[PDB]
Structure formats: C-alpha cells, structure tokens
Amino acid sequence: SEFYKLAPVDKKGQPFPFDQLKGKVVLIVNVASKCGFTPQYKELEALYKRYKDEGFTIIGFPCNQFGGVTFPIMKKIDVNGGNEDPVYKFLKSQKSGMLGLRGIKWNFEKFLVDKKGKVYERYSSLTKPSSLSETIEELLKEV
C-alpha cells in the first residue's frame, strides 16, 4: 500500500518510516501545537496505553493551522494548503466527503488505518478517542 511508503519527519527531525507500522492498527491524529487541550491528550494516551500491546499505535501530528503522551509525536506540519504534508495528502485521498471541503476542519481529527494499511474511516474532531475503542477492537482481530 501507498501508506507504508510514507516517511514523515519525527519530533527529533528524523525519518519515521510507516513500513514499521505493518500489521498494526494505526490512529492518525492531528494535534494542537498550542497548549490548553489536556483532556484530548489524556484520552489519546489512555487509548494508547490500553491497546498498544495488541498491535496498535497513535501517530500525532502537531499543527498550528487552527488558532505529555508516550505515543509517537512527529515534527510540526501543515495538514492543509499548498504545503500540506504527504501523509495528509494520502489520507484525504482515501477518506473525504463526496462533495465540499476535503481539508481538516479543526484540531484532533482522526484517521483509523488497517493492519494491511488501508484507511478504514475518518472521524471528526468532536468524536472522543474512547468512542473508537470498539472499532479499534474489530480491526485488531482482523484475519
């Protein structure tokens, strides 16, 4: 899949190749570059702690376009516009509404990815990470 070809820059400025994500369920979340969103990070961390050893991870992308965790955090990117990161170009090509805006609307929009690397679904910023647990569980059980 094109998903495993992706290699965004990580927080330390080093390549983070998505091929290491093979056989894993992945939650991709754009994260707030500014402070004041503690409840959101707590819920994500809880999801990660709960499921990480089932073959699950969360890749958090800092972004400043909408103005304390242990899962992978990447270098700050644009999720929208002419400088949109290739990861977000790919994600939106797999999951966007048929009409209207394809772009990310606000902080903490979420994409859930297959164990085979196929994007399962895109969720809005308002849907709480905990609400995705059951969907994560059925993807983890994939044959």
Side-chain angles (χ1 to χ4, degrees):
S1 67
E2 199 186 313
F3 181 76
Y4 297 133
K5 283 158 176 271
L6 269 14
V9 182
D10 77 3
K11 198 189 77 171
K12 308 279 196 101
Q14 295 307 321
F16 188 84
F18 274 20
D19 68 332
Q20 74 191 104
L21 267 33
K22 287 173 183 171
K24 274 75 175 282
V25 175
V26 188
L27 202 251
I28 298 179
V29 59
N30 63 110
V31 136
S33 190
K34 290 180 177 179
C35 304
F37 294 96
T38 325
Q40 287 67 230
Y41 300 101
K42 281 198 182 189
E43 280 207 41
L44 289 163
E45 183 63 9
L47 199 68
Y48 180 63
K49 290 193 179 299
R50 169 152 218 113
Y51 293 117
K52 62 177 171 84
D53 290 315
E54 305 292 315
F56 172 80
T57 197
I58 304 171
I59 316 301
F61 286 88
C63 182
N64 198 224
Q65 283 177 303
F66 314 104
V69 299
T70 60
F71 55 82
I73 298 292
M74 305 286 101
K75 187 185 171 196
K76 185 188 81 71
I77 57 151
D78 289 354
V79 297
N80 300 149
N83 289 172
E84 157 197 77
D85 192 88
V87 167
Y88 276 77
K89 192 184 179 175
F90 167 76
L91 290 174
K92 276 134 80 174
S93 77
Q94 303 305 112
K95 234 72 178 164
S96 280
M98 290 184 62
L99 300 171
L101 311 166
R102 299 166 73 259
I104 307 301
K105 269 77 183 282
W106 221 70
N107 293 315
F108 307 105
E109 212 160 298
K110 305 149 188 93
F111 295 81
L112 207 45
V113 180
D114 219 293
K115 279 185 171 292
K116 295 179 192 287
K118 296 180 188 285
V119 187
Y120 180 77
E121 191 53 279
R122 180 185 179 162
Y123 304 92
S124 67
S125 35
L126 294 176
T127 115
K128 318 230 85 173
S130 58
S131 288
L132 265 36
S133 68
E134 287 293 309
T135 302
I136 291 166
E137 285 191 21
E138 65 190 338
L139 295 180
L140 287 163
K141 297 178 194 188
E142 282 179 75
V143 290

